[PDB]
Design a protein around this ligand. Structure first.
Ligand SMILES: C[S@@+](CC[C@H](N)C(=O)[O-])C[C@H]1O[C@@H](n2cnc3c(N)ncnc32)[C@H](O)[C@@H]1O
Ligand SMILES: [Ca+2]
Length: 212
């Protein structure tokens, strides 16, 4: 959604999205084929294009309304394609050098996350990278309260409109997050040979898996 609001709602936006861009740029060639899963308005795709002008981007989302904003953002870009599809629909064949996602996969049931990670590995080239900029759960209810306080601290310090934070709270009611270490293990289960948490700010983390 509108870029200024996203930075108000998401702690360490530049660290987390920047880490995603950096790990892709160090993992794949300038001419990488990249799938952005749950691309929304295309914020992560845009961050990648800024660093990788010659990359082929496929932006995928279930929402035509969200992808309309991505289409406007990439109106003049000859190396961007749009696919309307659910995460649970058949993935595009590729192959891809990188599959990336931001703040989307935490909307799936856990079993669907585990299956998705396996399906993603099948469309990745050998040595290909999967990167997730993700909303994560604390490993305990007591730490989850602390995560929540730290998230709210960022939102308030960012002078976020009360109505946008209240709307944010409402959207978060149907989140299905899990801790970062569990999700990283699910990458290993899916057959990624290396997986790591690159950057983290309490509730928000950038992690990656390599296919070889
Ligand atoms: C909070 S937005 C993140 C958008 C963008 N990736 C970003 O970083 O700003 C979550 C996105 O995931 C999409 N989404 C949620 N569940 C999905 C699903 N099951 N299949 C496909 N897209 C989904 C939503 O339509 C929305 O565009
Ligand atoms: Ca969410």
């Amino acid at each position: 959604t509108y870029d200024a609001l996203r930075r108000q709602l998401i702690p360490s936006f530049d660290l987390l999205y920047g880490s995603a861009v950096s790990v892709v740029a160090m993992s794949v060639p300038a001419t990488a084929r990249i799938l952005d899963l749950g691309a929304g308005t295309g914020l992560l795709g845009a961050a990648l294009r800024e660093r990788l002008p010659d990359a082929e981007l496929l932006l995928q989302d279930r929402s035509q309304a969200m992808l309309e904003q991505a289409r406007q953002r990439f109106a003049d870009d000859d190396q961007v394609a749009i696919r309307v599809a659910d995460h649970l629909d058949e993935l595009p064949a590729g192959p891809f050098d990188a599959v990336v996602s931001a703040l989307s996969i935490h909307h799936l049931e856990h079993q669907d996350k585990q299956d998705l990670f396996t399906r993603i590995r099948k469309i990745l080239r050998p040595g290909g990278i999967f990167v997730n900029v993700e909303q994560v759960l604390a490993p305990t209810s007591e730490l989850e309260k602390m995560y929540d306080r730290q998230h709210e601290a960022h939102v308030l310090a960012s002078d976020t409109p009360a109505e946008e934070w209240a709307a944010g709270r409402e959207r978060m009611k149907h989140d299905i997050p899990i801790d970062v270490e569990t999700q990283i293990q699910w990458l290993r289960d899916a057959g990624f040979t290396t997986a790591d948490c690159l950057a983290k700010d309490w509730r928000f983390a950038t992690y990656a898996g390599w296919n070889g």
